[PDB]
Amino acid sequence: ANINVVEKKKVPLVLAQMDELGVPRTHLSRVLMDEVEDSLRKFQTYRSRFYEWGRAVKQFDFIEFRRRNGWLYDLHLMKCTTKQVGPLRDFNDPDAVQGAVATAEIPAFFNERPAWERPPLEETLYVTTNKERYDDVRGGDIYYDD
Amino acid sequence: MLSQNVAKTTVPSYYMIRTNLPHRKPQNQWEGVYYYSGITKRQRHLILL
Amino acid sequence: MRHIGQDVPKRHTHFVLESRLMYEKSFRDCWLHSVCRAISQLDEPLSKTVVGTHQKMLQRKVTCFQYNQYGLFKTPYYRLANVDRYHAVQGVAGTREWVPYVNVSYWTMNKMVRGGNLLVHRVHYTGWGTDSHLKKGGWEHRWNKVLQRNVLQYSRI
Amino acid sequence: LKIAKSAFGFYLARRGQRKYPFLRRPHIKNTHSMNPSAPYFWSFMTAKSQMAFLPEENYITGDWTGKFFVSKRQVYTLQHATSGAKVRVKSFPSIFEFNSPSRWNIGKEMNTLTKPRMDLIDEQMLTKKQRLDYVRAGLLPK
Amino acid sequence: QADRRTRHHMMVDGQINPREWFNWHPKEYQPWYFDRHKFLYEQRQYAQFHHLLC
Amino acid sequence: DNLQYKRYDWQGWYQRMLDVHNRNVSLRCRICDLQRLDGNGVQFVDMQTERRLRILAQHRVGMGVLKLDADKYEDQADNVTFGTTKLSELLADARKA
Amino acid sequence: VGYTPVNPDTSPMVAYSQYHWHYNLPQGMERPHSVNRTFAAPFQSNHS
Amino acid sequence: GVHRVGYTHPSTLPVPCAQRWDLRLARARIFQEYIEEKAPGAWQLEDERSMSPEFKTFTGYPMRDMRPGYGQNLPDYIMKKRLPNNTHYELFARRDIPNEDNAMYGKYLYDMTVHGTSLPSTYRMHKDINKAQRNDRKLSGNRFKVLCSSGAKNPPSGWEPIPDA
Amino acid sequence: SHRRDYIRMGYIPRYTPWEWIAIQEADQPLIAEQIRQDNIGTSYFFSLNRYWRYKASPHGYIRHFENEVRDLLQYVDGVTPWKQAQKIRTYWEVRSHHPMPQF
Amino acid sequence: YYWSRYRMPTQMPKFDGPAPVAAPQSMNSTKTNEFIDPIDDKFPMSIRGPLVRPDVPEDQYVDSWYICTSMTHHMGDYRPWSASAPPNAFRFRPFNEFDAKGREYVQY
Amino acid sequence: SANIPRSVWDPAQHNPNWSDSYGHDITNRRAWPARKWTVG
Amino acid sequence: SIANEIAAFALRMAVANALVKLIPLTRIPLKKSGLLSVDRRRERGQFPGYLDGKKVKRRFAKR
Amino acid sequence: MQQIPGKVDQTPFEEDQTWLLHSIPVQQLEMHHHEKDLQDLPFINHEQFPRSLEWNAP
Amino acid sequence: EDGIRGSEVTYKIVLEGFWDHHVMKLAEDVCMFLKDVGRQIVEEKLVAVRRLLQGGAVDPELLAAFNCARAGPFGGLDEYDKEEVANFLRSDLRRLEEQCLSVINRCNVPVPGATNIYDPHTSWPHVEKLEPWVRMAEFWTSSSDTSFTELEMSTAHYEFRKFFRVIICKLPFQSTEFEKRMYDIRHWLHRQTSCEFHTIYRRNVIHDSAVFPTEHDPATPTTHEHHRMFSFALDWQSAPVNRLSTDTVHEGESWDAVAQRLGCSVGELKDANAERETIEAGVVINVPVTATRRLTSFGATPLVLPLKTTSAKDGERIRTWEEAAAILDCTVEELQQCNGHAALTYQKKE
Amino acid sequence: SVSGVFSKGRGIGHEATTSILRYIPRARVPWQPSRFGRENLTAADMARLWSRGRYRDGPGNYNSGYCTERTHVLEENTVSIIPRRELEKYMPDITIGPKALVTPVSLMNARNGHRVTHDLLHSYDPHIGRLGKPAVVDHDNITVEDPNRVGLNAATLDCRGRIYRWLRRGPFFQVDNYFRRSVKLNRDGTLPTDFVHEAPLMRKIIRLAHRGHLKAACEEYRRVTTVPPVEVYRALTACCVPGAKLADAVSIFEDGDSKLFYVSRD
RNA sequence: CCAUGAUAAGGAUUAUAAAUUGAAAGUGUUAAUAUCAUAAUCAAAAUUUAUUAUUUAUAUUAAAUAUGUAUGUGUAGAUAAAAUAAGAA
Ligand SMILES: [Mg+2]
Ligand SMILES: [Mg+2]
């Protein structure tokens, strides 16, 4: 994500100081007051709103707004992760049977086949859909890449 | 229609009843609370104009 | 209803919901009720301003009022039935068949710990525990310590 | 429970002869409610103060079509005798009635004037086994 | 009263009964909108082609 | 709550519950800083003013520190208000010496 | 196992399984989440 | 012994000073305090148990007051009393309920947003699926039961149920 | 981010990395009431008496409820005809008619 | 699905072959513990020691939930007593002067 | 101030007394030969 | 009151350990006389199963 | 103990007899504490939050 | 106080896990974090302080604030020149530098082999242990309708635990930004771990002898009787009492007749009322808030309306209600409230 | 062959919409298509269902006194009811009537958000007590019988999701909904500020503030149920000026801003 | 109301040192057999159930309402518990 946005979180503090110093907040360029108002609308909230901001309705409506604009990717309830990453093999032993101690969902750019191993740009030259087998599979993976 | 609308449930059956597999994801602790911060195309237009 | 299209395996689970309303009712009526009692039974002069015949007058008026409330929840808490939010087993609170912190019956508690569902820790069955206070004075003393940190460390204003 | 005397006989277990914390037993049955005391007559199973008002049940709270029995905690009032009206209490098997008025009742609860456990025992509600056992106790003749 | 159309049936006439809610891949319940009034190739029956549109 | 009761319908009443459980505000001051020259030149709190103070507030004093706990209202704002009121009131009386 | 599903947040046997984080692993945060920063939703109340 | 409590007004003394009772009253104005006039002076009892370092049970505070007749019905008890509002009784009231997630959200909502649809409880679903599987061999062990009978008893103008054997 | 052994080969950060803190911090809004700035003074007269929806509400013990008590008295006395409350009896008043009330 | 998480990431070891060395196997009347190791409990204590788990400061041990046994909260790693105390600490100690009680009352 | 402290990334603020991650934990688990002397 | 033999035993052990800290060689006779020795004994933990709460199992009747 | 002036009062009793022979009653029913009643019995110890028993309000 | 023992603002973070080592390791993490954020902030305040020390002006406002006393310690209105005031300011800033350096120096002690975060000398912030919460659940593991005995013999002991580390940071000043990072640490908090925030800061309160005046005891005393149960709800107002800041000048009065009436100097009365050069009969005036004799709202003496010669409506006696409701400027219903006799006999006050 | 619970039912909404609407297919719940709710019940059936479901006090049960049966059978023994007029003779009648079931708005925070002391809980939201229409609470007319069916019934058909809904409510729910359902800006752009029943109060506040009693005026300010007119605030702050109290003036004005629709911006 | 699962109780020979005197073989409530019916505490209530340690002679009912019966030579048969900070050979 883009980090430096946190500096905007500084603002509702600075604003408060302006009141204590007696600098009127209404003398600001209209430009900057728009920018800063947007900053407020990002991070500031009251006690009032905060008691109610976790209503399930509001959460799900946000989910819906995301659905109509077709960004479901990051949401919690609304994504289903499929692909697993397999273990690394040791030359110290093939015999050793590894198994999973813990499992965590992390972005694929941590470990993904190095750029020189895979075919050239896959986004442009290959149309790939991850999909489920319709038949019963007796063993192996129930998700294959088409 | 929309390809990220993808079944969150397995086909209804007795596996739901006879197994300890849970029916939902557990809450993610570090997921922020979804809240509304933002503007419309209409509002941006108004401000610029 | 009439056992048509019932969702829950145990019908009596519904009682739990009912129970909740009971408690809700109390929140609404408690303050009211108690005031109405306190002003009612009070013999001494109520105050400097309200004394004598005015006092008896007001007292009877208030108890008349309290009586006229229909539906007011006066039932003492220990007379309400505790019931499992899971399997709807019941227990008498203050006995070994009810478990206070999870608010479930012995049956459910057993079921839930043995197959791991609730997270607890086994301790020697015969002792006081891991804990210091209970190790010291038993149930009563830990009770007291609770009273102490909820109330007594504050010097009220 | 062994015999179902009510609805709850299906739901409840007896759990042997089992001890409860002091003064809390789930089902209040006052066997002692009528328990003769000459000297303690005004202090026993009655208002802890003589200066208290009568309970809720000595008054008509709202617009009533009417009632069948008045609750057992309703105190007997001089009007209960004088007025000559039906005074009903829910006891077992069915209902107890104050029929033969007296001033010795006044100022006590009908919780106190109604014997909860009667010495009269119907043998028609008893199993043959039960009747045998009551004979053991030297209650029923045989 | 009740018949093969109203009743719960796994299979009506030697084939899987579509009238039963639980006889479908749950993905079918997932929401969609109506295509037909929009241009021929936006419509979902051409989906495999959608990445190529103009 | 960052954990469980964080994000859904119950988040509201839980949050509120916790805020009303914590509504206590403690208000402290030493009695060494109450002994200072007031704007009229009198010493604000002197020996007898302190004696009268200490007897006035009984257990509300310890270790030469006055501490008032205001629980009266559901929210911390009103308890700072209530607390300051009781403080200035107690000083008002104790100054009578 | 039952008609009442195990709520996966409370149940250790879920939490501490091989498909989640056991208590002896080091308990840090797995991945950051910027939700409200990436795509932001404008405010429309259901009430006017 | 038995005596009449007494008070010497500061004007009467051969040096004026603040009497301790006076202060007591000042205090009772400031922090509002009920003066219990019928309080017997002979009943002062420290609670031995919790107030003496000698017993293992020592909290340094008067845990209980020792009055044998003390009861919840007394008016004074009601004046210093904690109210059940916003105490644990409430937390129980709201979070302990048969299907836990009905505390977190409306079920219909969640389902309609996640799945496209509302889903039956698992138990209902068991009932149903079995209805299907066993209607597909035997018939007429059955009975037709509903909420409202007026739908089967007068069916609409169409509606000709398919005969079966 | 650059560490390709992260959860796979067993490297799990003991200290949560600066970047991630920056993000988690950047996501949630900051409550405005948490700033705590008072330059005026306490409002003695008005503040506690403010409009009933947003009002300062007493809590716990009944003493703190003084205002409410007044209202509950006034209101009650207004709605309750003495004609009616006449009828409510005290135990001794009733018992005066029992053949032996006093011993 | 929501269950897409709970698939087996790797292939589980098959059970190919016989009971392991000195397994419990049960003839006519035989009291059998699957739990107790056959070989290492039968070993005399004077040799092996009363120790169940490596002897190390118990802050490295946590009592497991659902299992009767303890585990290391840093899995499999161990620090010897020598790394708890300062360098060359007599009877490994915060300081060499006194024991716990001694430190405390000296301080008093 | 800055969101990420200057003392983290700026080499002018570098702390020379700091050690690498691996070194200390390697020297920590060392158990030195306990027969230092004859006789004991 | 701590006067009773068990508490006395404890007291003895205490004084002895002190004395050893003060006069090091004195530790040899003490140890041989079994002063410094600690015995581990406890009342049985409280428990509802037993009548008196400690050692006595409840009454048994043949069916 | 402070007391209301002009009221007739008693002083704590020195002579054991004066205690034993007075009309002071014994606890008979269940006993009540104004605070402790909310967390019900010693055996049911109701707690809203799992705060450390030592926990100190700032 | 110097060094460790003293601060302007103290934050205590109480971290709570389900497992001990969880909260311990958590405490180490959060602690390291606040060590770096702490160093940053305190460093900045240090460079600010050092600049301030190097030189700077003095407020007109601060100067004024030093010079407000009627009489300072030497018994006359004191003149603080801007030099002296700058000298005070400078003293305190020197102290602030001492404390900043203290904190910063502590921050730089805890190196990897040498880290000990429990002792407050060795690191900032430091960490205290807090006793774990432990609840033992005791219950029947048998389901038996048959026998109590058997239920009892089956009894298991299990426990719930909760573990607490406490994090202490004492700071020489109050930064809003530190509070921000600190409240924010709840968002990256460890798995299944929650926290509390205890803030203890210093805040100027203000005692007015104006609103809470210091007065002699009443010439009537207050008895025990004013204190019964519900005397709090009935016989008393909530303090402070309402004193009038506004007063009407009586006829034969002059400036110091009014001033001797209100219990204040003539100068004062002239200054609160500075707008007016002269005070005629029947004019409203501003009572200087330092006046001794200021009146309470609604003195205890009831206003009484005699029937008498009234208006021209009769010139004989007053009759109907709203006539008097116009005379006394109130709603008729109030007047009916007060007089229970005059309400029940009739409305024409026969 | 047909066993139902009720014989007949009715539609939620009327001809004008339905006769046309039926031409557009509505998607029914997939597993249970046919919905019969408590809004579909007839008059009699609803009356009966609202009687049952409250333990003892509720009208359905026979000894509650609201029972309209003239006879009731306890285990083969038939009991004839005692009429109320006869019940009065030994058991004095104290009835305040409707108004004793309703506390003022003042107490509402003490009562955890209710004005209503009735047997069922009364929500000030539209959707919990909703039958076919949105629920509204009459504070004048409250009866044991509850004609409008606005109360929250424990055991009735369809009650479950409602009860859940109640337990899920936000911390200010009762209060907030009571405040917003009444007291809203007029279609004109006119403040709600002018209401007949509360007018003498505002007159009293102003008249008190003018003679310079600030505390008195505020103590009466507390009792105000509706938004007070701008004149009130003018009077209060103008009273605040002479004694120099700033803080109280500011908090007054801050009470009028954004809370009360900015009556105090003037 | 027919409608499978699953956790209790129950001492009989791995011992003393740096150490536990409570066990798997299943005791109402729990997941695939359906085809008579609404039975559930929110107070103040009706003994027949094998499976339970009660206060025994100087002083004796005050707060939720709180037990009126059995003095009989420590007395039939038959039964109960314990080797654990206690003291048994
Ligand atoms: Mg029911
Ligand atoms: Mg079984």
Which experiment gave this structure?
A: cryo-EM
Chains that touch J (3 or more CB pairs under 8 A): A, B, C, G, K, N
Tokens representing residue O54 in the block: 């409250």
F68, F58 Cβ separation under 8 angstroms = no
Asked whether at least 3 C-beta pairs link E and M within 8 Å, the reply is no
Q: How far is the CA of C107 from the centre of ligand 2 (A)?
A: 14
Backbone angles phi, psi at N228, to 5 degrees: -65, 180
Query: In Å, what is the separation between the CA of L4 and the C1' of P86?
Result: 12
Q: Which of I47, I65, I80 sits opposite O251 (nearest CB)?
A: I47
The answer for A117, left when phi > 0, alpha when psi is -120 to 50, beta otherwise, is alpha
Q: Which residue has the tokens 């159309």?
A: E5
Determine whether the interchain pair B35/I27 forms a contact, defined as Cβ–Cβ distance below 8 Å.
no
Tell me the three-class secondary structure of B22-48, residue by residue.
Answer: CCCCCCCCCCCCCCCCCCCHHHHHHHH
Cα H122 from Cα B16, distance rounded (Å): 7
Q: Annotate C100-143 with DSSP letters as a single string.
A: TTTTEEHHHHHHHHHTT-S--EE--TTS--S-HHHHHH-HHHHH
Judged by C1' against the alpha carbon of D40, the nearest nucleotide is P61
Query: CA-to-C1' distance for L10 and P86, Å?
Result: 14
Task: Measure, in angstroms, how far nucleotide P80 C1' is from residue L16 CA.
Answer: 46
Query: Is-contact H34 H79, C-beta < 8 A?
Result: yes
Ligand number, closest to the Cα atom of O156: 1
**Most C-contacting residue of O99, O107, O112 (CB-CB within 10 A), to test interface:** O112
Per the CB < 8 A criterion, the answer to whether O252 and O236 are in contact is yes
Q: Which nucleotide is nearest to H70 (CA to C1')?
A: P63
Give the ligand whose atoms come closest to the C-alpha of residue N143. 2
Tokens, residue N150: 């058997």
Nearest-nucleotide field for C4 (CA, C1'): P38
CB contact under 8 A, E26 and H125: no
Q: Give the gap in angstroms from C-alpha B32 to the nearest C-alpha of chain I.
A: 6
CA of residue O158 to ligand 1 center, whole Å: 14
Phi, psi dihedrals of residue C77, rounded to the nearest 5°: -60, -35
CB pairs under 8 A between A and B: 35
Q: How far is the CA of C15 from the centre of ligand 1 (A)?
A: 7
DSSP H helices, J10-90, are 38-41, 45-48
N59: left (phi over 0), alpha (psi -120 to 50) or beta: beta
Are β-strands O2-6 and H144-148 bridged in parallel, bridged antiparallel, or unpaired? parallel
Which amino acid appears at position D67 of this protein? K
Which residue of A lies nearest to J14 if distances are taken between CA atoms?
A97
**Phi-psi group of I10: left, alpha or beta (phi > 0 → left; psi -120 to 50 → alpha; rest → beta):** left
Chain N hits for A10, Cβ within 8 Å: 177
CA torsion, points D129, D133, D138, D142, in degrees to nearest 10? 20
Give the distance, in angstroms, between residue L44 CA and nucleotide P83 C1'. Answer: 14
- Which residues, 6 or more positions from O32, have their beta carbon under 8 angstroms from its beta carbon? C5, H120
Chain B nearest-CA residue for H123: B17
Ligand 1 centroid distance, CA of D7 (Å):
12
| Residue M57 contacts residue F24 (beta carbons within 8 Å) | yes
Q: Are N68 and N109 in contact (CB under 8 A)?
A: no
Q: Note whether C touches I: 3 CB pairs or more under 8 A.
A: yes
Q: Which residue places its CA closest to the C1' of nucleotide P8?
A: N142
Contact O122, O149 (CB under 8 A): no
The residue behind tokens 């609201």 is O66
Residues on chain C touching J66 (C-beta within 8 angstroms):
116
How many residues comprise chain F?
97
Cα maximum dimension of chain G: 51
- N5 DSSP assignment: G
Separation of first and last alpha carbons in chain D: 28
Three-state secondary structure readout of chain O: CEEEEECCCCCCCCHHHHHHHCCCCCCCCCCCCCCCCCCCCCHHHHHHHHHCCCCCCCCCCHHHCCCCCCEEEECCEEEECEEHHHHCCCCCECCCCHHHHECCCHHHHCCCCCCECCCCEECCCCCCCCCCCCCCCCCCCCCCCCCCCCEECCCCCCHHHHHHHHHCCCCCCHHHHHHHHCCCCCCCCCCCCCCCCCHHHHHHHHHHHHCCCHHHHHHHHCCCCCCCCHHHHHHHHHHHCCCCCCHHHHHHHHHHCCCCCCCCCC
Q: Which of O173, O127, C81, C86 is nearest to F10 (CA)?
A: O173
Is O touching L (3+ C-beta pairs, cut-off 8 A)?
A: no
Beta bridge partners of residue F70, listed in sequence order: F25
Looking at the complex, report in whole angstroms how far the Cα of residue B27 sits from the nearest Cα belonging to chain G.
Answer: 7
Q: Which two tokens stand for residue B12?
A: 């209804």
- The two structure tokens encoding residue N344: 């029940």
CA distance N87 to N56: 11
Q: Which of K27, K28, K36 to mutate to test the interface with J (most CBs of J within 10 A)?
A: K28
Q: Which nucleotides of P are covered by protein (CB under 7 A)?
A: 1, 5, 7-10, 14, 17-20, 22, 24, 27-35, 37-54, 59, 61-68, 79-82, 84-87
CA distance N25 to N32: 11
> Residues with Cβ < 8 Å from C70, sequence gap 6 or more?
D61, D62, O57, O101, O117, O118, O119, O144
Instruction: State how far Cα H16 lies from the chain centre.
Output: 55
O65 and D66 in contact by Cβ < 8 A?
A: yes
Are residues D30 and D18 in contact, defined by beta-carbon separation less than 8 angstroms?
no
Four-point Cα dihedral H65, H68, H72, H75, nearest 10: -80
Chains that touch A (3 or more CB pairs under 8 A): B, F, G, H, I, J, K, N, O
- Smallest Cβ–Cβ distance between G24 and the set J5, J66, J75 belongs to J75
Residue of H nearest to I64 (CA): H32
Q: Which residues of C touch D26 (CB under 8 A)?
A: 92
**What DSSP string runs through chain F?**
--SSSSSSTHHHHHHHHHHHHS--EEEEEESSSSSSB-TTSSBSS-HHHHHHHHHHSSTTEETTEEEEEE-SBSSHHHHHHHHHHHHHHHHHHHTT-
The nucleotide whose C1' lies nearest the CA of L56 is P81
From residue N129, alpha-carbon distances to J60, N164, O48 in Å are: 18, 7, 62
CA to C1' distance (Å), from J41 to P17? 15
CA of B7 to C1' of P80 (A): 66
The separation between CA C126 and the C-alpha centre of its own chain, rounded to angstroms, equals 29
**Residues F26, F67: contact at Cβ < 8 Å?**
yes
Helix (H, G, I), strand (E, B) or coil at C37: helix
Rounded to the nearest 10°, the torsion over CA B12, B17, B23, B26 is -170
Output the CA H148–ligand 1 centroid distance in Å. Answer: 21
| C:D CB pairs within 8 Å | 26
Judged by DSSP in three states, C41 sits in helix
For the CA of B19 and the C1' of P7, the distance in angstroms is 18
Cβ separation C34–I62 shorter than 8 A: yes
- Cα–Cα distance between L6 and L1 in angstroms, integer? 12
In total, chain A counts a number of residues equal to 146
Supply φ then ψ for residue C137, to 5 degrees: -105, -10
Element at H29 (helix H, strand E): helix H20-30
- Nearest-5° angle of CA I7, CA I9, CA I14? 55
